[PDB]
Amino acid sequence: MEKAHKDVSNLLLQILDDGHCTDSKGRRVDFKNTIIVMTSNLTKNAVLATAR
Amino acid sequence: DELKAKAEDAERRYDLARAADIRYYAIPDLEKRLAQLQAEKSQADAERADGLLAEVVGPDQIMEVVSRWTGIPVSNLQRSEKEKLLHMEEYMKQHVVGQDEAIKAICDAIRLSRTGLQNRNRPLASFLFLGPTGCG
Amino acid sequence: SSMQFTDKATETLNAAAKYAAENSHVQLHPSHVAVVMLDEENSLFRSILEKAGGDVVSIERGFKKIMVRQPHSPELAKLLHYAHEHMKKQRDLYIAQDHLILALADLPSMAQVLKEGGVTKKSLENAVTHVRGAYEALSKYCIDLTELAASGKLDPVIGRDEIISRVIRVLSRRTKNNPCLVGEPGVGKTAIAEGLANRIVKGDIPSSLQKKVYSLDIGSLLAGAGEFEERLKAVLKELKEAQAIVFIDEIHTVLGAAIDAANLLKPMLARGELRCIGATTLTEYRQYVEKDPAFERRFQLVMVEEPSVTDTISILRGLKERYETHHGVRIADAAIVAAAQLAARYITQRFMPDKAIDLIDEACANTRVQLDSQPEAIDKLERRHLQLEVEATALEKEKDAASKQRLQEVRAEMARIQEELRPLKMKYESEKGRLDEIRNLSQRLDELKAKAEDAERRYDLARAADIRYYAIPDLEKRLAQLQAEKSQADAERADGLLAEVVGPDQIMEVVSRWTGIPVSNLQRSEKEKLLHMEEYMKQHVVGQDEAIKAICDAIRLSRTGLQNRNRPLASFLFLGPTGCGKTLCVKELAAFLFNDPGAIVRIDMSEYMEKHAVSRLGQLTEAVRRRPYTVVLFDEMEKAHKDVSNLLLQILDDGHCTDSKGRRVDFKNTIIVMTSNLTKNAVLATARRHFANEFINRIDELIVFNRLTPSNIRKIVDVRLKEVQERLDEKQITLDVDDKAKDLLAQQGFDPVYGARPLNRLIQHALLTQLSRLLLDGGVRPGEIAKVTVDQEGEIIVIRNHGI
Amino acid sequence: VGEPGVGKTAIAEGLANRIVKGDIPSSLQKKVYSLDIGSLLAGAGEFEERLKAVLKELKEAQAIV
Amino acid sequence: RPLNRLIQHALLTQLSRLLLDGGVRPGEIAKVTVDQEGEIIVIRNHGI
Ligand SMILES: Nc1ncnc2c1ncn2[C@@H]1O[C@H](COP(=O)(O)OP(=O)(O)O)[C@@H](O)[C@H]1O
Ligand SMILES: Nc1ncnc2c1ncn2[C@@H]1O[C@H](COP(=O)(O)OP(=O)(O)O)[C@@H](O)[C@H]1O
């Protein structure tokens, strides 16, 4: 989750706030039971400061 | 079940005297007899030390069909919810050995959003795996 | 049975009697029908006879000699009887001009002239086969608006006096005599032409205009096949010889295109032999009218502006009686004003008055179900009595020692419910036939008012004299008596007072359902919100005492009337370091003034920094049109170029932005907030140098944030821990924190070099972490007051009382 | 509005149970009818004559479909 | 430039507060004088 622009970054922000995304067909899938995990690569104090 | 289906037609066919005989006499009499036979049958299960079982449809019967279609045994589904989150940090350390400070932080965000300490508008947990790869 | 004749076939016998009246005649002979058909433009009686041969001149001269020998004719009665008997014989095709040929061939008096002229009887069979395969076409393919307007079957038009009067001036001109109601799908376009037809019968139109109004149906002309040319040319021919104005709904779909249909309307509108009234959308108006220079020469731009909140109230007063008849309810006067004010401040689906009528239709329909299907206040007592009555009867038939004791407890609770259910059940049975009678007595009076007005307008003072003077005055006493006895009986039940009269509380229920805003937030007026605004912001945002007062000083000056209507609500420019209260202050603004935290759009400058994305500020223009009361947040304003600030200059100066589709979005009631991370005197002068000298002067308040003081840290932990206890009130768990634990977390999380972000993370990784640990093993049980104090080694720990 | 599988046929079937019972307002009684498209195409303009007769019977009787 | 902001942050600020609670009724004459402290204040003409 680092090889993309800013289109998919702003779409995933509303999931962590409202809890559901706006579907193109017209649905509101509630993400209250779906965990969100990511994988990237950006002692341990200087590593997390790069991804910020 | 026959009197239950016939009682629905009484409220539609405009029958006040007919509905007063089913919704006030047929239902109570048919429910007391069914509940009486269930209590007398359960008393004979302990007087023989091997009574007729395999009749109470519950967690032991619903989980058996799912276990055959998927593959996960029934013993992995009959566990309590309040007991799985306590031993969750100890089960992940069996195969993954080396990240003693990372596995403990995983259960900190899951056990907090399931006890009312987190807003319901947010998902379960939000993680961000960083650092070099190959750790797990 | 009954026969059905078209308007063209009906006027055929009338036109034949007019020609015979000048030649001194007392009866109408069927031979006069063939004479009228031979004097029309592109008639069908001549082309059909040409295929079979014969001599039409010998037949035409033979029919003219029969009418001279004449002294309802007895021979005409046989023609009307044959049209009714042979109306169920052949196959398809109704009645028209070609079907009347076979009716004249069956008459013995007309068959002798045909046989002696040329075309015999056998030639008429093969002649009508090859040709096979308001007037005539104005009845099935068109709908006359003046007919439904004079018959009392049209909704009143109130509030369009400034638009209808302008269309009359356009039709009276020599050139550009084709009005086009250019507007939007929601401001009203078809109802505008409805009021013009009302002034035609009354006589309010000038003498220069005497035409009619015909609604051209687009879907009716496309019924079937190829064969579209025979249906379109028939409508234009009937409108030329009759001189009438046709109305075309959505002209962008029929004029400008699959099957070519706009080519038949260009020569008619150019020679002045046709007058059309357009009503399309401005979006498609610039692609079908302004594109062709020949269309602009005949069409005139007529703008349709959406009415304000003052005219919308008068619009609902006209359609108030229409809903009081169908719904059978009483609409109060206070619900009309509140409907026009709540239709543009919370929900927005169309425009005025379209977005205001649905609130009255939905509110009046909710009372229909809540009264005939037993109200909730009455059904609640019946459901509780049904569960106790079925249980008491089961214990009476069972003789047991434990059944007699349980029956006494059920009977004690059954007598209390039955004491209050009988006065409500017996009253509901009497009000069932009385409330349904009001709707039955109102729908009949509505139809009598329509038939009474139709007779007075069609010169018939013999039928309407028994309706307005007898059928109506004798029925208003019974309808008013049932409405007075019903309102008095509702007060005796002490419940369901707002279940039959649509009032202010009834309109707020529909708005609260179509969004999610609680009812308690709807009753709060706009005047009381500006008074208790400073006390609400201090409860969530502390430390910035000089910034909260500056926000209210820029909003109160725009609502009273001390500033011109050329700027939005309040333009802000937040500065200071990060983590000082730039994002939380924006979220708290919409939760009090807008009553919608989710209505805050976020347009980041990470993707709109390029010059190609400047025109999409458009995506931002279209987004704010759907939701008027929105919060536009400008994050990372320091990274924006000069093209962004130049586009927002016309918004704060003219009050609106130039839309790409020619629309106009109102930017008067829209807040303008920004976010930037640029002692306090040199910080403010830095932001004024990067931007232009004019953009910084237009901004009202220039709030400059500062770092958090150590004295305000103690207040942060007092209001942050309160939200944790509020989320645990559902489990009956009281969270109490002593003064010792409130001072340890305040001296460790103090980090002014970054903001208040590491502040709450230290509490969650210590206080909130160990609190959820005891909620799974058996430490803290739902129903015990928890205690959090400081231990002996200095660590936030939760005091437990139960083991594992 | 819904995907073919969420339950749309039972909505019209459950509404007919409340019509005969009396849960609907007596001032405006409706009747539920099922317009099957398979029986209308059993002949052959046959479809234009069979469908027009069904819609006429619903306007003079005040009922849904 | 500071003159346009001084008349709004002193004379127009206290004037808008009286128009929201009941200080200046529509139909009276507003009087703005200088008090003994030294600040442009808006004197109301209505009881609290
Ligand atoms: N404790 C372990 N024992 C054995 N294999 C492991 C262990 N931890 C990680 N691995 C292996 O290392 C690999 C890491 O793959 P990874 O880089 O995560 O793939 P991706 O980049 O597609 O997510 C896995 O395929 C896994 O098999
Ligand atoms: N003066 C008025 N009084 C009552 N209703 C009006 C008035 N003006 C417009 N309307 C309503 O606005 C609606 C406009 O409908 P129409 O022009 O067909 O499409 P659109 O809703 O897209 O404009 C009409 O249904 C009418 O009831």
Ligand SMILES: Nc1ncnc2c1ncn2[C@@H]1O[C@H](COP(=O)(O)OP(=O)(O)O)[C@@H](O)[C@H]1O
């Ligand atoms: N006045 C305040 N008192 C206590 N906490 C605050 C205050 N203002 C902001 N916060 C905290 O700051 C967080 C939001 O920070 P944010 O405004 O996004 O920082 P930035 O302005 O750097 O973007 C919130 O979680 C809130 O708890």
Ligand SMILES: Nc1ncnc2c1ncn2[C@@H]1O[C@H](COP(=O)(O)OP(=O)(O)O)[C@@H](O)[C@H]1O
């Ligand atoms: N009494 C009922 N209770 C619950 N679900 C029902 C009931 N009656 C019908 N359904 C559901 O409605 C669905 C109807 O399916 P079907 O008629 O095939 O297509 P559609 O879902 O489009 O109507 C069924 O899948 C069934 O599960």
